């Protein structure tokens, strides 16, 4: 599949200057319009303009662009503006190697392409035909990568790594936000779910406004379990680390306080962390998998709307970010703040974290956490104690009670620092039921 050149274009939301002739117009006469030739439909670049899910699934590509404005501003998602003076302030040939540096600093950790995030009134497409070329899909010419970026200069193409000192964007992809069916302007739309990014009259705004309200539309209601996104850090080891803590943590809260019921809000798959361990495991989510949803409850918990219930045993809150906790729960959370390639600038001061999946996650508040306190670093086995000395009050072991710990706990205790360190550093946070104490793990040996 691709966008069909031959689509229509609603031409409404573009600015009083820039005419119809007849107003059905279609993508395929746009890009002409925009000063370029598509002969390119057998080389893999069938459309510059992409389908909302082919988008979604390059949403580490989304820059937003708009143009305000003889000389033009351009303004990014970045923060980054540039004023253009045309040949007839700063010229293009400089201007088109700035916009290349910009995108190549930015990406090239996250996507092997570009895609503009548009609210076009006209101008901003007029604009593309002075740095942007389109020809075949080529790879780089020092790697494998696609190339993104052409030099002039030398008539070569590079990726976002290979590009210094290159002058074109090279078959960037781009959305129009108007095309999905708003009314309105940008700001009117943008403002309904975020305060976060402010109007000042500058091209950078709009532009970070309209990947905003995209990142609002496309992520924000629910995870899309059907799609994936490829490794591009530390995925699989942060997420063997995640799952060897949680196990770990309910775990010992299962053992050090008795509880006889557990409450697994934010689990949409039925899939216990603990499966061995005795005690009612429920399943609860806002959005459960179809196929599982006959053994786990449709509900969406806030604090104002449920505090009257989950009054018996533990709420566990695996990365399930509500309003506020209640105080009988363990808590994963991300911190939004935390820079890294798989978090992503979201909706209103929340992020967008991509990890395999993407999962926009409210903004990081202490608040939220007001019932409840930090969980202590500890390690806890109750396994068999087979064979520098491990001197450590938080090894909660057999062996610890008052021997030298044995060849066995002392490896998984340094294993287990090693994933709760990985997982610490990844921008993960835990939080626990302020009653739970170590001593009532002490007690079960
Ligand atoms: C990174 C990640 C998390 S996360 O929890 O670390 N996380 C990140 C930050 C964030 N912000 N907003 C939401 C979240 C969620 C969860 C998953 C995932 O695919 N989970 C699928 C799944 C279930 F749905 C239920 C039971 C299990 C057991 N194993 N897996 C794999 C299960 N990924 C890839
Ligand atoms: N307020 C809320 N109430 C219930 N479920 C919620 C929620 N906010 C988010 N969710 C759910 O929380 C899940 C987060 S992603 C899956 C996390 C899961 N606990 C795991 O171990 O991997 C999603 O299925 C989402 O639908
Ligand atoms: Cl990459
Ligand atoms: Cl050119
Ligand atoms: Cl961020
Ligand atoms: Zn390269
Ligand atoms: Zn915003
Ligand atoms: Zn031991």
Redesign the pocket.
Known sequence: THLSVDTKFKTEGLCVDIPGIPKDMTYRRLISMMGFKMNYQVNGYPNMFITREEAIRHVRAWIGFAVAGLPLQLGFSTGVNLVAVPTGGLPWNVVRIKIVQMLSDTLKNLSDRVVFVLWAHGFELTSMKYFVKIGPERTCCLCDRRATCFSTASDTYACWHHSIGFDYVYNPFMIDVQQWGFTGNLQSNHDLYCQVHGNAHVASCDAIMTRCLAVHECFVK??DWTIEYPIIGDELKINAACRKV?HMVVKAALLADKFPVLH?????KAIK?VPQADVEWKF????PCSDKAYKIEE????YATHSDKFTDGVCLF?????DRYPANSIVCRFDTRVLSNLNLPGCDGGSLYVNKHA?HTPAFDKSAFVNLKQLPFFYYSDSPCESVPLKSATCITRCNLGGAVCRHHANEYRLYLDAYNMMISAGFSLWVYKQFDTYNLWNTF
């Open positions: 629910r995870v949680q697994d809000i934010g689990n949409p962390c609860y989510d806002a959005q509900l969406f918990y806030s695996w990365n399930c970010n509500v999962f």
